[PDB]
From a paper:
The E. coli 50S large ribosomal subunit is composed of 33 proteins (L-proteins), one 23S and one 5S rRNA. The 23S rRNA consists of six architectural domains that, stabilized by the L-proteins, define the shape of the 50S subunit with its three protuberances. Here, we present a biochemical and cryo-EM based analysis of the earliest period of 50S assembly, utilizing an in vitro reconstitution system with purified rRNA and L-protein components. Taken together, early 50S assembly occurs in a domain-wise fashion, while late 50S assembly proceeds incrementally.
To differentiate states occurring during late assembly, emerging structural features such as the central protuberance, or helix 68 were added to their names (C-CP, or C-CP-H68). In addition, we noticed that the 5S RNP (ribonucleoprotein particle), consisting of 5S rRNA, uL5, uL18, and bL25, can dock on a pre-50S particle as soon as the central region of domain II has formed. This can occur both in early (d12-CP, d126-CP) and late assembly (C-CP) and goes along with formation of domain II helices H38 (A-site finger) and H42 (GAC), as well as domain V helices H80-H88, representing additional examples for rRNA induced rRNA stabilization or folding. However, the CP remains mobile and upon rotational movement of the 5S rRNA towards the subunit interface, H84 and H38 stabilize each other. However, completion of the CP can also occur after the formation of state C during incremental late assembly.
Numbering used by the authors:
A (entry chain V): 1 to 94
B (entry chain F): 1 to 177
C (entry chain W): 12 to 81
D (entry chain O): 2 to 117
Write the structure that this text describes.
RNA sequence: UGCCUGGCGGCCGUAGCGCGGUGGUCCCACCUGACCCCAUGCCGAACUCAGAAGUGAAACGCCGUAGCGCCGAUGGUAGUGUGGGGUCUCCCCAUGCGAGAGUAGGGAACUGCCAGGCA
RNA sequence: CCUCCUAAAGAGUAACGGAGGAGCACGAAGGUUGGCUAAUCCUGGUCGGACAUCAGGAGGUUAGUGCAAUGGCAUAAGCCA
RNA sequence: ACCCGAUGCAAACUGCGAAUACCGGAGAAUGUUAUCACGGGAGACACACGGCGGGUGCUAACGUCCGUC
């Protein structure tokens, strides 16, 4: 249900991830099915705000990018050892 | 093969009636009789084991096989390659005659006969004995015996389960437990 | 103790002549394939002239060294 | 078991003769039938083959599997091979003892004209 | 050419383990007796000599079973070559190389030759 | 003299660096042909104590491979003839 | 004890596993052959410091030495 808005990725590599982390964002991925997986960016502020509830891994989240709404599900999250900053999130189209 | 015809006549038929089997060979059969005499205390001398082997040969129709220690251990003071046990490997026509003679005459003459131990099963249809006082057979005279040995017949049977093994034992007499 | 000579002397794609030692080993890390011998010291040598080749064969995934003639 | 035992017994000689890259002749036994075929070094191709199952060889055999049947199979394979031009191929017993029908087949093949 | 059965190679678990079903047309298997070809460090145990008398019980061919083994992404990270920076003990930056670990998905094989039976 | 690292995924590479063995032996413990393949647990029993030979299932080389150790061995390089 | 789920670690553990470096084959460009062999003549035969990956120490140490620049 949550409307998640992001920018389409255009650079592949650890440089983009480092730049996003510096700019207070982080990379993620949306896969699930035979269609080509899509790399996406997540804005730490809004994503953490919506994830503060316990429904993040329970209900079907909604990515609205470029005016297109797609349903996805969260499988696992990579959490920093001690820093309270999100690192990477995998999403399954379901 | 003296008892082969009698088995095919009665045992197959009654097992078929009991177990509603389909094919003839589904009934449990006899794979072999393991006439193994494990003295255990052969360390005293080789002559005791030699006499045991001679008695086994006289009872059977072929020379027995001598089995050595499987591995060397210190707790049981057994080395490696030491001849310890003796067994008889019978696979042919003499098995039927030997089994018939046993089930006929060797069963009743058992001291304090309180029933064969029916709770000894490997887990899939192998039935074992641990009895002593092997003088039951009259073929051996008292003038050629110096001690009392043990009979540990462990029948190798084609039975697929303990129920089938018990049914076969009941078929071959086995009065009670 | 002086260090012994181990490792592979001739690698894949290298042209070698007959009798050329390919790999020196204590046991059998690699097994002779085509036109390859095996000495008493588990040393592999080429019995002909050609290029070396490394592959995997057998149910246990064993490394094999062979010589392909040109 | 029996089949695994036979395969593990035969594989040694089979691979050892494969190292030489020499055309071979193999014989398979069964109390009911006997098979024989020539195998090229690749192993995916054959040169000649003869079996007791076919009527062309079973017509004059009282029983499919016997010493006479083995001799007939051996001479038939040796013939087919000499017309084909095998030129002295090797022989493999396929992990079978060389004291029965395998020996009969080998003797028949050797006496038919082959010099293996 | 359609199905079934056996042998010989590639491939070396997507080819595996467990469960169910099915198979006697041919072929394969169970096994009868064995002085005869054979031999047991004892055993017709292995191998070999005389079947359809019966069967597919055990073994084995085939189908399903995603319980399980196994293969396996995209993406992130670790790690590191060259240059630079710092609080140079260790870390960061532009650039290149970047996978096991976990998921998506795959997964009860396929391929070449010969032989016999049912079509 | 030999084995582990040390020793920075080719080879080599030092330190009052730390870990162990050997001065052999075999006329079989070699060659050839054939046959075979373990540790342990459980089930059973009178000596058997929980762990004596024996029957079977799992296991599939953790055994064995004469030397202390390393790497190999199912084709077994291990065992018998 | 056995023993399922593993946690904390291994220079003398690796069912996984890089980046580099070394090895061989093809190719453009470029370098005064910069490559190899033989012969004459040598010098040196106590190196210092710094960067990187390391050994050990007292998670002080120019400690106590290595491979590369």
């Amino acid at each position: 249900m949550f409307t998640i808005n992001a920018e389409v990725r255009k650079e592949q590599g650890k440089g983009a991830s480092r730049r996003l982390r510096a700019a207070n964002k982080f990379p993620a991925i949306i896969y699930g099915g035979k269609e080509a997986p899509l790399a996406i960016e997540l804005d730490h502020d809004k994503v953490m705000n919506m994830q503060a509830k316990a429904e993040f891994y329970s209900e079907v989240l909604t990515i609205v990018v470029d005016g297109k709404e797609i349903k996805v599900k969260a499988q696992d999250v990579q959490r920093h050892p001690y820093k309270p900053k999100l690192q990477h999130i995998d999403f399954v189209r379901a | 093969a003296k008892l082969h015809d009698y088995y095919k006549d009665e045992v197959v038929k009654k097992l078929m009636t009991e177990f509603n089997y389909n094919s003839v060979m589904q009934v449990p059969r006899v794979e072999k009789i393991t006439l193994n005499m494990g003295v255990g205390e052969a360390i005293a001398d080789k002559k005791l084991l030699d006499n045991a082997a001679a008695d086994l040969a006289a009872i059977s129709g072929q020379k027995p096989l001598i089995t050595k220690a499987r591995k060397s251990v210190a707790g049981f003071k057994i080395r490696q390659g030491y001849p310890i046990g003796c067994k008889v490997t019978l696979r042919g026509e003499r098995m039927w005659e030997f089994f018939e003679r046993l089930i006929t005459i060797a069963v009743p003459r058992i001291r304090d006969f309180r029933g064969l131990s029916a709770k000894s099963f490997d887990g899939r249809g192998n039935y074992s004995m641990g009895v002593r006082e092997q003088i039951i057979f009259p073929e051996i005279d008292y003038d050629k015996v110096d001690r009392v040995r043990g009979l540990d017949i462990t029948i190798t049977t084609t039975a697929k389960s303990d129920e089938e093994g018990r049914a076969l034992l009941a078929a071959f007499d086995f009065p009670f437990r | 103790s002086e260090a012994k000579r181990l490792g592979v002397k001739r690698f894949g794609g290298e042209s070698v002549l007959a009798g050329s030692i390919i790999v020196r080993q204590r046991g059998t890390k690699f097994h002779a394939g085509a036109n390859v011998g095996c000495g008493r010291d588990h040393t592999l040598f080429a019995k002909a002239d050609g290029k070396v080749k490394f592959e995997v064969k057998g149910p246990k995934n064993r490394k094999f060294i062979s010589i392909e003639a040109e | 078991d029996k089949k695994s035992a036979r395969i593990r017994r035969a594989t040694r000689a089979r691979r050892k003769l494969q190292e030489l890259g020499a055309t071979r002749l193999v014989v398979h036994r069964t109390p009911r039938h006997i098979y024989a075929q020539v195998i090229a070094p690749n192993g995916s191709e054959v040169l000649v083959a003869a079996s007791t199952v076919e009527k062309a060889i079973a017509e004059q055999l009282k029983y499919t599997g016997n010493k006479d049947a083995a001799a007939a199979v051996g001479k038939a394979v040796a013939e087919r091979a000499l017309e084909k031009g095998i030129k002295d191929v090797s022989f493999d017993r396929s992990g079978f003892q060389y004291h029965g029908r395998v020996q009969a087949l080998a003797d028949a093949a050797r006496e038919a004209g082959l010099q293996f």
